[PDB]
Amino acid sequence: VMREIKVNKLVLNICVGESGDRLTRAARVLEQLTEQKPIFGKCRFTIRSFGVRRNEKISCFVTVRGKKALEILEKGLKVKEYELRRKNFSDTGNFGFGIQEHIDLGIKYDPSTGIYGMDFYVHLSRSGYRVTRRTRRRSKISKTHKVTKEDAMKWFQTKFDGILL
Amino acid sequence: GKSRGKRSGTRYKFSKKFRKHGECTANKYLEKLNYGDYVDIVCDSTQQKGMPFNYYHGKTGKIFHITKRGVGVLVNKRVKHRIEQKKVCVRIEHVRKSRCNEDFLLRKIKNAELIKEAKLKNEHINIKRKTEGPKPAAMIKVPPSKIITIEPLPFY
Amino acid sequence: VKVVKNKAYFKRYQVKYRRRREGKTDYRARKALILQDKNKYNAQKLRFVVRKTNSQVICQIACAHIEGDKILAEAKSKELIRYGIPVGLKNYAAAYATGLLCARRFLKSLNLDTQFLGVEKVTRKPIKAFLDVGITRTTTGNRVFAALKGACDGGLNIPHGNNRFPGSKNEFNPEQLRKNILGIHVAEYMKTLQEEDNDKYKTHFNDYLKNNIGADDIEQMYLNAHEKIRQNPEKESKFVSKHEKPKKLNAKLRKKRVKEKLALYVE
RNA sequence: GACUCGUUCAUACUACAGUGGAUACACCAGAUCCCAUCAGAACUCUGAAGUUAAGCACUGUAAGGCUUGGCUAGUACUGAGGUGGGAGACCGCUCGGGAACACCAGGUGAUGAGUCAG
RNA sequence: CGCAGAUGUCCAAAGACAAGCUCAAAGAGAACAGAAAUCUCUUGUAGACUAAAAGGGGAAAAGCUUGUUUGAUUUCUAUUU
RNA sequence: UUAGAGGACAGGGCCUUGACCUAUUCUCAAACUCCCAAUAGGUAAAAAGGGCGAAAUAACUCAAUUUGU
Numbered sequence: 001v002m003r004e005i006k007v008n009k010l011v012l013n014i015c016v017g018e019s020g021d022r023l024t025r026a027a028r029v030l031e032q033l034t035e036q037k038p039i040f041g042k043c044r045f046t047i048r049s050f051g052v053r054r055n056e057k058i059s060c061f062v063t064v065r066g067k068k069a070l071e072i073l074e075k076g077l078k079v080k081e082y083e084l085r086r087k088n089f090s091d092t093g094n095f096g097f098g099i100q101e102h103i104d105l106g107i108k109y110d111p112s113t114g115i116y117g118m119d120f121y122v123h124l125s126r127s128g129y130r131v132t133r134r135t136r137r138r139s140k141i142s143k144t145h146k147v148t149k150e151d152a153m154k155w156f157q158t159k160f161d162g163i164l165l
Numbered sequence: 166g167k168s169r170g171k172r173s174g175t176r177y178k179f180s181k182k183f184r185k186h187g188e189c190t191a192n193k194y195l196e197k198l199n200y201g202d203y204v205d206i207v208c209d210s211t212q213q214k215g216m217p218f219n220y221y222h223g224k225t226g227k228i229f230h231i232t233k234r235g236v237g238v239l240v241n242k243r244v245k246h247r248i249e250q251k252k253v254c255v256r257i258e259h260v261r262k263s264r265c266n267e268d269f270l271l272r273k274i275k276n277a278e279l280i281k282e283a284k285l286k287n288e289h290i291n292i293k294r295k296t297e298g299p300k301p302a303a304m305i306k307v308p309p310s311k312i313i314t315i316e317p318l319p320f321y
Numbered sequence: 322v323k324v325v326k327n328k329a330y331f332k333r334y335q336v337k338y339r340r341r342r343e344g345k346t347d348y349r350a351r352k353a354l355i356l357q358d359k360n361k362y363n364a365q366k367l368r369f370v371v372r373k374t375n376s377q378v379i380c381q382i383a384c385a386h387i388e389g390d391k392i393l394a395e396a397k398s399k400e401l402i403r404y405g406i407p408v409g410l411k412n413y414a415a416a417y418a419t420g421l422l423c424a425r426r427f428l429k430s431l432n433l434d435t436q437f438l439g440v441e442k443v444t445r446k447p448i449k450a451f452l453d454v455g456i457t458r459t460t461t462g463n464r465v466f467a468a469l470k471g472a473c474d475g476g477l478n479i480p481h482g483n484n485r486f487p488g489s490k491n492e493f494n495p496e497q498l499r500k501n502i503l504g505i506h507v508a509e510y511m512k513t514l515q516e517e518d519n520d521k522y523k524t525h526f527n528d529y530l531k532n533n534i535g536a537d538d539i540e541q542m543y544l545n546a547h548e549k550i551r552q553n554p555e556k557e558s559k560f561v562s563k564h565e566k567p568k569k570l571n572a573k574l575r576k577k578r579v580k581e582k583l584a585l586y587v588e
Numbered sequence: 589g590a591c592u593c594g595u596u597c598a599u600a601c602u603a604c605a606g607u608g609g610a611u612a613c614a615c616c617a618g619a620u621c622c623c624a625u626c627a628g629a630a631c632u633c634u635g636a637a638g639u640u641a642a643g644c645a646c647u648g649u650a651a652g653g654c655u656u657g658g659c660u661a662g663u664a665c666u667g668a669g670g671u672g673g674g675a676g677a678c679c680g681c682u683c684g685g686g687a688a689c690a691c692c693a694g695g696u697g698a699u700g701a702g703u704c705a706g
Numbered sequence: 707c708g709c710a711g712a713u714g715u716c717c718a719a720a721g722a723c724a725a726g727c728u729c730a731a732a733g734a735g736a737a738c739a740g741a742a743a744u745c746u747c748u749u750g751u752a753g754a755c756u757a758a759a760a761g762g763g764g765a766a767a768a769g770c771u772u773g774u775u776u777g778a779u780u781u782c783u784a785u786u787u
Numbered sequence: 788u789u790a791g792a793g794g795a796c797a798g799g800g801c802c803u804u805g806a807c808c809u810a811u812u813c814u815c816a817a818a819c820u821c822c823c824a825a826u827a828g829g830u831a832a833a834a835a836g837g838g839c840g841a842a843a844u845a846a847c848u849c850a851a852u853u854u855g856u
């Protein structure tokens with residue numbers, strides 16, 4: 001009635017594995033896609049096989065909501081022509097998928113910028129989620145109010161008319 | 166070599182009890198103190214400022230000084246053929262109002278009215294406490310059906 | 322996967338204080354606010370409590386005794402209807418007026434109102450009280466500082482700074498604070514939402530139009546309410562419960578419920 | 589029927605369930621302004637279309653935990669005496685003090701100050 | 707000349723104050739990505755961290771991140787080990 | 788630190804031995820602790836003092852020439 005499922009947010013993530021020019025180009029790609037400034041993530045460790053160090057920037061990501069999120073999700077799902085695996089849904093109620101080329105989202109290619117991939121992840125939830133995030137009297141959500149794995153698949157099929165493999 | 170520090174030998178003395186960690190309550194800060202009062206020194210390890218020394222944990226004294234957050238206490242201590250008065254300065258969390266005095270105060274208050282009444286009727290009153298003494302004789306009724314006989318037990 | 326909430330988990334657990342557990346009381350701010358000098362005794366150090374709920378604001382005077390603190394004055398935001406202010410009872414101005422009421426009511430209870438006149442229309446030693454802000458975070462423009470200004474406009478002395486008033490991050494401008502006291506910002510929002518998207522104006526301020534309050538007379542009703550509050554601050558001179566609360570059982574009753582459940586399962 | 593500030597700091601916690609909305613407590617509708625971020629999610633400000641689904645309140649689980657009695661048990665241990673026993677290791681007597689785990693049964697709160705509606 | 711160990715150092719911040727925040731780890735899920743890169747979500751009484759031995763203390767903090775600073779300043783008493 | 792039992796990633800092609808989880812089971816600690824004695828310790832048990840009223844002195848304290856001390 002007012003326990004229907006909406007989209008809480010959407011996070012786009014590009015892990016380049018190195019710092020320097022390529023990371024900045026990926027950040028520019030994300031900015032043109034979202035009209036927002038992204039931020040960077042840093043390695044907590046140092047791994048010799050990967051060649052990365054602590055406190056070193058490795059990736060860039062951004063989070064979106066509102067009307068803007070539902071259309072970026074629309075584009076991404078369209079590149080998948082509305083088909084997802086059943087393994088893509090977690091047992092808490094979220095899902096996600098990936099893409100190989102950022103051109104197919106309608107962004108004009110530039111010879112200098114190059115090609116990049118990214119990830120999509122949604123975090124479905126109902127309303128009343130405020131009580132677990134506010135400062136004053138934060139509490140816990142009851143178990144019935146959560147979104148189970150099957151509710152997530154029904155929501156996907158009913159909204160986007162997609163099919164599960 | 167020998168190790169005689171300030172907090173040596175206080176592993177179990179200065180530790181919190183089971184499921185009773187954390188800093189003190191807020192009412193602890195509303196306690197009333199006056200000059201000459203009796204007080205107990207009990208170290209609270211979760212406040213590291215102004216802790217007492219090892220020896221004095223659990224002793225009782227009198228107040229000789231009150232400050233912004235501190236109290237001076239007079240405490241006896243045995244040194245090898247005599248007793249010395251020590252002046253201990255501690256902070257207010259390690260201080261508790263002593264309960265060693267309350268029976269005397271209640272006794273005085275209660276005996277006041279008994280004296281006033283006895284003199285009002287011109288009676289003879291005795292107010293000193295009585296030590297437990299020998300018991301008087303009595304006649305105890307018991308049905309014969311209620312006495313159970315016992316005897317030593319065999320070994321098993 | 323090894324379960325983490327074992328029996329040994331529940332045996333070793335220590336629980337916080339109830340009001341910390343409920344997200345209401347700080348308990349580091351509180352004790353620093355109640356404690357006084359141990360040799361300055363027979364002084365109580367009152368505090369001025371401001372709480373803002375949803376659709377209302379509250380003010381109080383506390384005393385912090387040993388078996389539970391005592392309240393000496395109290396005023397709620399919904400009282401302002403009697404003083405001529407219809408709906409709008411969460412404003413900056415509403416909080417200021419509520420803070421004024423508590424001070425004026427507290428002075429009259431002691432019979433000191435004629436000696437401490439405070440300040441007139443907005444532009445012995447006084448009794449002192451320290452501000453208790455609760456859980457919220459204190460940014461510039463927070464409504465708790467309007468209630469403080471209203472209480473100081475009465476006879477009370479509440480110590481404070483100047484950098485937390487609206488528009489005063491690094492320069493104190495009294496004009497901005499005065500405009501927010503009189504509700505100019507709300508009137509300007511009403512003005513600007515009318516030029517564009519007029520239907521949103523009709524929906525958003527639905528009870529302002531319904532109660533015949535326009536954008537042009539917002540300041541005057543607050544200026545009149547201040548005077549009426551100063552004139553007379555004295556507080557104005559069994560329910561049915563159609564639903565009923567279920568009660569608890571006992572040991573003997575619980576056994577028969579097990580008898581019945583097992584018997585029903587048998588066949 | 590509800591709220592604000594407290595005191596005990598689990599009989600007050602935890603996991604699942606059932607029931608409730610005159611006023612109130614909430615979720616909730618927005619971003620011009622004070623303010624805030626990658627992000628009006630949070631924080632801050634301005635409101636009153638919708639809902640008890642959730643927070644919250646009361647109750648229910650041969651529920652876990654916690655708490656109070658009974659038992660374990662005069663058992664384990666121990667102060668004073670002995671030209672007591674025994675190769676010893678160890679163990680009784682006289683005058684006295686006295687546990688713990690486990691197991692069984694009941695319980696799941698109480699309260700200070702001040703207000704609102706009716 | 708019993709047992710297991712440590713000291714002759716180190717820090718303009720690792721000193722002072724305030725605010726916001728919550729940590730180890732496990733599970734499920736996301737292009738290259740794998741046992742371990744970076745992202746969300748559930749659980750989480752400290753299983754992390756707190757210069758250096760060991761012990762005590764610590765969760766809207768004493769831990770992490772920010773902002774402003776030089777109370778690591780001059781003089782004197784009552785006293786503890 | 789010994790041993791089986793019941794459940795749902797390694798293995799020789801539907802079964803080893805395992806791994807993981809759940810309830811048990813034999814035995815232990817000067818430098819382990821949910822609990823916790825006997826013995827050994829400390830303070831108190833009224834007259835230079837206590838109780839209950841009024842008045843006076845302060846440059847201290849308080850919103851207070853009355854608030855307190």
Ligand SMILES: [Mg+2]
Nearest residue numbers: 347349350455
């Ligand atoms: Mg604070």
Ligand SMILES: [Mg+2]
Nearest residue numbers: 607640641642
């Ligand atoms: Mg319901």
Ligand SMILES: [Mg+2]
Nearest residue numbers: 650651652653
């Ligand atoms: Mg039970």
Ligand SMILES: [Mg+2]
Nearest residue numbers: 186752763764
């Ligand atoms: Mg600890």
Ligand SMILES: [Mg+2]
Nearest residue numbers: 724725766767
């Ligand atoms: Mg802090």
Ligand SMILES: [Mg+2]
Nearest residue numbers: 689814815816
């Ligand atoms: Mg044994």
